[PDB]
């Protein structure tokens, strides 16, 4: 129902964390508890992150009102000759915040949230990766919003400087006027301000790139683990392998990368106008663009996976098995739910791209269509879903080597096109039903202890007789 | 040479391998705390840059021993100068730097001995005349992959530095590329002439091959260079040793005295005041030995609590309307100044602590004669008299233009509260009885500092203000003594033919037009840098001569006020110290400190006298100022009688601002007498002739330029004008009497009508004045001191509609307007052209309008509702 006193009674280790935060924090500790009821009653979240430089001002004025009044009532009682001064001491440090009210709301709102982390952590101990991912993406969105605001402000300041320089140029006044000295001095000041804004924007962009690379390198092992779990679950074992969290994460990452690249394009286009000497932007823009492109390519290269391997529809008991002259069902998904709204996306298929060097293997040709087209609205309605439920294979000891089916896609978005390839789990082709009785055991021989998935060359009781 | 091979090897490398080579045995300093210490605003116990440890390593090992006066070339942020300031034998540190984009600028700090260090920015060393010095430091130089350009830069640096050294000067100069022959041969002769050698600083990074040239050492160049090159090429063979972190130095805090004093006090006058002040705070009375005062006497100090901050209230209501003005740097950089004890000390050191020189005999005689004649001339129709208590009560009751005073917050809380009590009058009577016997006991001043921005000093029409507060009783006593000067309008244009006191702002343009109708040369409008601190004792003695027209108790009181207070002053000022905050008490004889109105009158008188003397000199009446002889004294007196009155009608002096139209252009070349009295001009060479104007619409006066306007029917008006940025930026500042919505709303509405009355003729200010008056809920009296304190009009504070006031001011009460046909709408009033508006600072005409035009219609009609639950009423 409240805070402060709850933290005090809890225990020392959380008090030390409380001690550190509130100490260096400008807001004095004493003022926190006297005004505790009022502070927690205010909607600081709306003031810090919203559109209306009026609510922040209102909260500013009310804060001053409360600070002034409470001092007077306590000043009437003597022997409180230390808190009264502290009330006036805080009244001086609030004064610089009058320039920008929103600085108050952000500082208070952040302070309220942090002690909530301590409280929940303390009770949980007394009585992970996904939450870290969500926190990371939330911070990313917030600081990207901050970067957007900074870019807009820089654009406006550069525009007004260009207008002032233009009106000075059309003036054509070569005089020894002290007004001219004043205006040249203020021109130098404007140039210094512009340089400072540019360097700050560059630093923020670099921080964003670092954080986003960290998120991607944390994300990829989850995809690898899901692939391993899918391999272990396709072998007649019930284990869920849902893709919703991974697809959402991939979509968020793709959106963030595209937004970052698009902003840098506009930044360079703006900088072109009044580009001049000692401009780090001329190199920073291209280096950041190259890094962003590299990260996008790296993410998209592993972003292609196959949800469902080619399976027998009539007999689902045996997966990863092929028979001549029959239809097969395959499902491939893109973890990134992004696509241009005017261009359909095209996916091709192939079988046995790389043949072995041994005696001529049983190469097979896809009689049916190897190409499928997805309508753009399908990505919105259900996602990037590819289904081939009628694929067939024909033939141009039986289980000594396996065959690999490959998927190839050209992904295009915002003018960037990348070639993408992926492979499915190795499979064996049988020309008759009877040989499957030993083909199952031979497939197990490959599956149980294969460290390389692309190598075409007691405990079992959970599989042999689990059915 | 081996250095070339080392450089080629380093150049042939990759970035990843490069980034690891840097730290392989160097010594680092742990700056993990200094960065965030400086970021939050701390100004002590910290090192600004990394060079402090670099120079410390040399000093502790007594390679170079600074002493006397130290000159730093290219100080950058200023680590070396700040470190040197805290040493023992150092007496003064001077630093020059070349600021601007891509370059470091100095920053202010308050470490030990911070008052002995002075730094400058935007000065190029390569074309600076040499000056006397005892120690020389140079740390300039930039690296480049090409060795030839590095050699050229090193040669240029050496040639620049060579001119400064003498036989007995300590030096420490950085040399960048010493391993190739064309620098070696040059350094041979230098080492032969001046001695010293080269040594390497261990703390330097491994990427560079720089060295340093020191004063107290010996050896051979080539052997040392070869040894260093061999070590460099052998270094990249072992493992990666973790750099040995070293703790950053701390500099403490406080001030440091130099040991010279040049002022002697008069104890028989101020002994009682000093004794009383000491007895009041006897508990913590102590003598400090580190007072930084040179030209002021020092007596003692005690303890107090710090008052002040950085930046003030910004008017909330005024904002949210001038949204497009946030990007403009002039508006924001001028917002508010610093009044903390550190800023007060900085201002006091910069401006108040100065010294002036006495004039010669001829100047003294001329000033005496002119002052006598002028005093006899002004009092031809008037007669001095004493003021009463009832007038003072009436003035204080109606919130008149009282001086800057403190109301003795202990016993009472406000002036109006304190007037009605009888004990206040008992204290006043006691002080009056003491004064009547030529003694004073409770007449001390309080100082407060202001004026401290970068771009704010160029647009606040002031800077270095340093205003003086006074007790209420002393203010009443001074009023009783010398209120007749202002209550009788002694300096009006009717009585004295030069003053403009009592004229509103909207009427000075006509006066300037009338001055231009005479025959002569051009108009000259020079100004003085820091007029208030250039007043000598002679000016005070000359102004004291008004008592010759008084008699009796009035004469005795006036003489006592002039003698015991105006030229024997005691002042309290704050000072930061390691133990907290202390208050010092100091004394001084000359310089001007008094009430505002008395100061205005006396400044006007002195300015008139000085201008008359300069006009005398230009005409060639007298020749030599060293000594004045007979047949010139009579000539001077005859000139004053014959044409004295008509010469005073060629000028217009408000305060310390003057505009003069002489008889001939010889006026611009006569600068001996003006420089002799100490009235040095501002931003000009000492003997450079002045500059005139051939048009009356360009001459500045009271920080204004006066355009002229033509109505639709044909009548012509003259209107004031300024730079719009200054007006908008000042309109955002609240004086600090708020802590409420009603106060700030009333203030905004109060000086949102100045714009509708005076500055109505420009597009961008007449639209922003209707919105603000449509946003406040009306029905509230707009009572608050706005601006232009000296202009005694304050007439836009009425309640009725502005059209009637405009008709009453600009038509019927305008002597220079012939026909009196009135107007009946706000559309007949014209605008300030189209391009002249952009010239003076508007935001219309091109893409800036593409940004602003969001303000109009789209934003105004929605922000007025954004005001919130606070009601209003439409006006547009
Ligand atoms: Zn007195
Ligand atoms: Zn103008």
PDB file of C-alpha atoms in Angstrom, chain B residues 695-851:
ATOM      1  CA  UNK B 695      21.999  59.822 -40.307  1.00  0.00           C
ATOM      2  CA  UNK B 696      19.907  60.272 -37.174  1.00  0.00           C
ATOM      3  CA  UNK B 697      18.001  56.992 -37.632  1.00  0.00           C
ATOM      4  CA  UNK B 698      21.138  54.937 -36.897  1.00  0.00           C
ATOM      5  CA  UNK B 699      22.472  56.594 -33.728  1.00  0.00           C
ATOM      6  CA  UNK B 700      21.938  54.335 -30.691  1.00  0.00           C
ATOM      7  CA  UNK B 701      20.612  55.833 -27.476  1.00  0.00           C
ATOM      8  CA  UNK B 702      19.460  53.945 -24.369  1.00  0.00           C
ATOM      9  CA  UNK B 703      19.937  50.714 -26.350  1.00  0.00           C
ATOM     10  CA  UNK B 704      17.464  51.719 -29.056  1.00  0.00           C
ATOM     11  CA  UNK B 705      17.326  52.876 -32.666  1.00  0.00           C
ATOM     12  CA  UNK B 706      14.439  55.045 -33.834  1.00  0.00           C
ATOM     13  CA  UNK B 707      12.689  54.350 -37.126  1.00  0.00           C
ATOM     14  CA  UNK B 708      10.086  56.645 -38.669  1.00  0.00           C
ATOM     15  CA  UNK B 709       6.682  55.605 -39.965  1.00  0.00           C
ATOM     16  CA  UNK B 710       4.002  56.918 -42.328  1.00  0.00           C
ATOM     17  CA  UNK B 711       0.300  56.368 -41.688  1.00  0.00           C
ATOM     18  CA  UNK B 712      -2.361  55.799 -44.333  1.00  0.00           C
ATOM     19  CA  UNK B 713      -3.714  59.361 -44.336  1.00  0.00           C
ATOM     20  CA  UNK B 714      -0.258  61.002 -44.338  1.00  0.00           C
ATOM     21  CA  UNK B 715       0.741  61.778 -40.739  1.00  0.00           C
ATOM     22  CA  UNK B 716       4.238  60.722 -39.679  1.00  0.00           C
ATOM     23  CA  UNK B 717       5.284  59.184 -36.357  1.00  0.00           C
ATOM     24  CA  UNK B 718       8.613  58.251 -34.785  1.00  0.00           C
ATOM     25  CA  UNK B 719       8.759  54.906 -32.989  1.00  0.00           C
ATOM     26  CA  UNK B 720      11.373  53.005 -30.940  1.00  0.00           C
ATOM     27  CA  UNK B 721      12.877  49.686 -31.953  1.00  0.00           C
ATOM     28  CA  UNK B 722      15.165  46.925 -30.680  1.00  0.00           C
ATOM     29  CA  UNK B 723      16.439  43.460 -31.598  1.00  0.00           C
ATOM     30  CA  UNK B 724      13.422  41.187 -31.211  1.00  0.00           C
ATOM     31  CA  UNK B 725      15.467  38.327 -29.750  1.00  0.00           C
ATOM     32  CA  UNK B 726      16.405  40.384 -26.692  1.00  0.00           C
ATOM     33  CA  UNK B 727      12.789  41.359 -26.007  1.00  0.00           C
ATOM     34  CA  UNK B 728      11.494  37.805 -26.373  1.00  0.00           C
ATOM     35  CA  UNK B 729      14.297  36.380 -24.239  1.00  0.00           C
ATOM     36  CA  UNK B 730      13.754  38.913 -21.465  1.00  0.00           C
ATOM     37  CA  UNK B 731       9.987  38.346 -21.509  1.00  0.00           C
ATOM     38  CA  UNK B 732      10.586  34.751 -20.377  1.00  0.00           C
ATOM     39  CA  UNK B 733      12.338  35.643 -17.108  1.00  0.00           C
ATOM     40  CA  UNK B 734      10.547  35.909 -13.769  1.00  0.00           C
ATOM     41  CA  UNK B 735      12.202  38.154 -11.193  1.00  0.00           C
ATOM     42  CA  UNK B 736      11.536  35.648  -8.406  1.00  0.00           C
ATOM     43  CA  UNK B 737       8.391  37.098  -6.792  1.00  0.00           C
ATOM     44  CA  UNK B 738       6.217  34.184  -7.909  1.00  0.00           C
ATOM     45  CA  UNK B 739       5.658  30.840  -6.167  1.00  0.00           C
ATOM     46  CA  UNK B 740       2.113  31.158  -7.498  1.00  0.00           C
ATOM     47  CA  UNK B 741       0.015  31.140 -10.641  1.00  0.00           C
ATOM     48  CA  UNK B 742      -1.665  34.504 -10.086  1.00  0.00           C
ATOM     49  CA  UNK B 743       1.628  36.376  -9.662  1.00  0.00           C
ATOM     50  CA  UNK B 744       3.264  35.078 -12.833  1.00  0.00           C
ATOM     51  CA  UNK B 745       0.056  35.381 -14.857  1.00  0.00           C
ATOM     52  CA  UNK B 746      -0.342  38.997 -13.745  1.00  0.00           C
ATOM     53  CA  UNK B 747       3.287  39.785 -14.593  1.00  0.00           C
ATOM     54  CA  UNK B 748       2.932  38.244 -18.044  1.00  0.00           C
ATOM     55  CA  UNK B 749      -0.234  40.212 -18.706  1.00  0.00           C
ATOM     56  CA  UNK B 750       1.440  43.336 -17.303  1.00  0.00           C
ATOM     57  CA  UNK B 751       4.337  43.431 -19.753  1.00  0.00           C
ATOM     58  CA  UNK B 752       2.363  41.880 -22.568  1.00  0.00           C
ATOM     59  CA  UNK B 753       0.897  45.387 -22.966  1.00  0.00           C
ATOM     60  CA  UNK B 754       4.255  47.118 -23.381  1.00  0.00           C
ATOM     61  CA  UNK B 755       4.332  45.349 -26.742  1.00  0.00           C
ATOM     62  CA  UNK B 756       0.838  46.561 -27.660  1.00  0.00           C
ATOM     63  CA  UNK B 757       1.689  50.163 -26.724  1.00  0.00           C
ATOM     64  CA  UNK B 758       5.293  50.796 -27.819  1.00  0.00           C
ATOM     65  CA  UNK B 759       6.345  47.919 -30.110  1.00  0.00           C
ATOM     66  CA  UNK B 760       3.015  47.630 -31.935  1.00  0.00           C
ATOM     67  CA  UNK B 761       4.521  48.300 -35.362  1.00  0.00           C
ATOM     68  CA  UNK B 762       6.069  44.868 -36.004  1.00  0.00           C
ATOM     69  CA  UNK B 763       4.272  41.758 -37.196  1.00  0.00           C
ATOM     70  CA  UNK B 764       5.749  39.084 -34.965  1.00  0.00           C
ATOM     71  CA  UNK B 765       5.152  40.880 -31.642  1.00  0.00           C
ATOM     72  CA  UNK B 766       1.586  42.135 -32.112  1.00  0.00           C
ATOM     73  CA  UNK B 767       0.274  38.596 -32.657  1.00  0.00           C
ATOM     74  CA  UNK B 768       2.021  37.152 -29.596  1.00  0.00           C
ATOM     75  CA  UNK B 769       0.486  39.868 -27.395  1.00  0.00           C
ATOM     76  CA  UNK B 770      -3.163  39.100 -28.158  1.00  0.00           C
ATOM     77  CA  UNK B 771      -2.804  35.417 -27.272  1.00  0.00           C
ATOM     78  CA  UNK B 772      -1.260  36.004 -23.846  1.00  0.00           C
ATOM     79  CA  UNK B 773      -3.964  38.507 -22.907  1.00  0.00           C
ATOM     80  CA  UNK B 774      -6.616  36.086 -24.187  1.00  0.00           C
ATOM     81  CA  UNK B 775      -5.149  33.296 -22.035  1.00  0.00           C
ATOM     82  CA  UNK B 776      -5.197  34.941 -18.586  1.00  0.00           C
ATOM     83  CA  UNK B 777      -8.669  35.021 -16.965  1.00  0.00           C
ATOM     84  CA  UNK B 778      -8.757  38.846 -17.111  1.00  0.00           C
ATOM     85  CA  UNK B 779     -10.270  40.752 -14.176  1.00  0.00           C
ATOM     86  CA  UNK B 780      -6.831  40.713 -12.516  1.00  0.00           C
ATOM     87  CA  UNK B 781      -4.928  43.966 -12.056  1.00  0.00           C
ATOM     88  CA  UNK B 782      -1.509  43.749 -13.794  1.00  0.00           C
ATOM     89  CA  UNK B 783       0.578  45.244 -10.983  1.00  0.00           C
ATOM     90  CA  UNK B 784       4.296  44.407 -11.151  1.00  0.00           C
ATOM     91  CA  UNK B 785       7.532  46.241 -11.973  1.00  0.00           C
ATOM     92  CA  UNK B 786       8.246  45.174 -15.556  1.00  0.00           C
ATOM     93  CA  UNK B 787      11.317  46.935 -16.983  1.00  0.00           C
ATOM     94  CA  UNK B 788      12.857  50.292 -17.942  1.00  0.00           C
ATOM     95  CA  UNK B 789      13.143  51.452 -14.331  1.00  0.00           C
ATOM     96  CA  UNK B 790      14.717  54.791 -15.267  1.00  0.00           C
ATOM     97  CA  UNK B 791      11.942  55.698 -17.727  1.00  0.00           C
ATOM     98  CA  UNK B 792       9.326  57.184 -15.394  1.00  0.00           C
ATOM     99  CA  UNK B 793       6.247  56.415 -17.473  1.00  0.00           C
ATOM    100  CA  UNK B 794       4.799  53.077 -16.290  1.00  0.00           C
ATOM    101  CA  UNK B 795       1.544  54.119 -17.944  1.00  0.00           C
ATOM    102  CA  UNK B 796       0.510  50.888 -19.716  1.00  0.00           C
ATOM    103  CA  UNK B 797      -0.656  49.518 -16.342  1.00  0.00           C
ATOM    104  CA  UNK B 798      -4.217  50.838 -16.617  1.00  0.00           C
ATOM    105  CA  UNK B 799      -7.219  48.546 -16.878  1.00  0.00           C
ATOM    106  CA  UNK B 800      -9.315  49.913 -19.747  1.00  0.00           C
ATOM    107  CA  UNK B 801      -9.032  48.845 -23.367  1.00  0.00           C
ATOM    108  CA  UNK B 802      -5.811  49.515 -25.248  1.00  0.00           C
ATOM    109  CA  UNK B 803      -7.309  51.398 -28.205  1.00  0.00           C
ATOM    110  CA  UNK B 804      -8.370  54.357 -26.043  1.00  0.00           C
ATOM    111  CA  UNK B 805      -4.942  54.461 -24.406  1.00  0.00           C
ATOM    112  CA  UNK B 806      -3.262  54.400 -27.822  1.00  0.00           C
ATOM    113  CA  UNK B 807      -5.400  57.286 -29.067  1.00  0.00           C
ATOM    114  CA  UNK B 808      -4.726  59.254 -25.889  1.00  0.00           C
ATOM    115  CA  UNK B 809      -0.958  58.729 -26.033  1.00  0.00           C
ATOM    116  CA  UNK B 810      -0.095  59.044 -29.724  1.00  0.00           C
ATOM    117  CA  UNK B 811      -2.512  61.805 -30.807  1.00  0.00           C
ATOM    118  CA  UNK B 812      -3.884  64.212 -28.209  1.00  0.00           C
ATOM    119  CA  UNK B 813      -0.839  64.384 -25.892  1.00  0.00           C
ATOM    120  CA  UNK B 814       1.621  64.669 -28.792  1.00  0.00           C
ATOM    121  CA  UNK B 815       2.872  68.268 -29.135  1.00  0.00           C
ATOM    122  CA  UNK B 816       4.544  67.464 -32.458  1.00  0.00           C
ATOM    123  CA  UNK B 817       1.270  66.311 -34.061  1.00  0.00           C
ATOM    124  CA  UNK B 818      -0.769  69.061 -35.703  1.00  0.00           C
ATOM    125  CA  UNK B 819      -4.204  67.603 -36.510  1.00  0.00           C
ATOM    126  CA  UNK B 820      -6.040  65.546 -33.907  1.00  0.00           C
ATOM    127  CA  UNK B 821      -8.391  63.367 -35.945  1.00  0.00           C
ATOM    128  CA  UNK B 822      -8.643  60.015 -34.121  1.00  0.00           C
ATOM    129  CA  UNK B 823      -8.686  56.407 -35.328  1.00  0.00           C
ATOM    130  CA  UNK B 824     -11.282  53.781 -34.461  1.00  0.00           C
ATOM    131  CA  UNK B 825      -9.762  50.381 -35.282  1.00  0.00           C
ATOM    132  CA  UNK B 826      -6.609  48.309 -34.975  1.00  0.00           C
ATOM    133  CA  UNK B 827      -6.232  48.033 -38.748  1.00  0.00           C
ATOM    134  CA  UNK B 828      -5.386  51.673 -39.523  1.00  0.00           C
ATOM    135  CA  UNK B 829      -2.061  51.311 -37.686  1.00  0.00           C
ATOM    136  CA  UNK B 830       0.592  50.330 -40.266  1.00  0.00           C
ATOM    137  CA  UNK B 831       3.550  47.937 -40.100  1.00  0.00           C
ATOM    138  CA  UNK B 832       7.337  48.259 -40.269  1.00  0.00           C
ATOM    139  CA  UNK B 833       7.717  47.627 -43.961  1.00  0.00           C
ATOM    140  CA  UNK B 834       8.522  44.119 -45.104  1.00  0.00           C
ATOM    141  CA  UNK B 835      12.302  43.596 -45.148  1.00  0.00           C
ATOM    142  CA  UNK B 836      13.162  45.941 -42.282  1.00  0.00           C
ATOM    143  CA  UNK B 837      11.187  43.583 -40.051  1.00  0.00           C
ATOM    144  CA  UNK B 838      13.432  40.669 -41.024  1.00  0.00           C
ATOM    145  CA  UNK B 839      16.484  42.911 -40.637  1.00  0.00           C
ATOM    146  CA  UNK B 840      15.718  43.605 -36.976  1.00  0.00           C
ATOM    147  CA  UNK B 841      15.054  39.949 -36.160  1.00  0.00           C
ATOM    148  CA  UNK B 842      11.671  38.700 -37.364  1.00  0.00           C
ATOM    149  CA  UNK B 843      10.980  35.137 -38.537  1.00  0.00           C
ATOM    150  CA  UNK B 844       9.005  35.799 -41.724  1.00  0.00           C
ATOM    151  CA  UNK B 845       9.781  35.765 -45.433  1.00  0.00           C
ATOM    152  CA  UNK B 846      11.153  32.299 -46.209  1.00  0.00           C
ATOM    153  CA  UNK B 847      11.639  28.801 -44.742  1.00  0.00           C
ATOM    154  CA  UNK B 848      11.777  30.254 -41.237  1.00  0.00           C
ATOM    155  CA  UNK B 849       8.159  31.151 -41.948  1.00  0.00           C
ATOM    156  CA  UNK B 850       7.627  27.541 -43.030  1.00  0.00           C
ATOM    157  CA  UNK B 851       8.634  26.662 -39.469  1.00  0.00           C
TER     158      UNK B 851
END
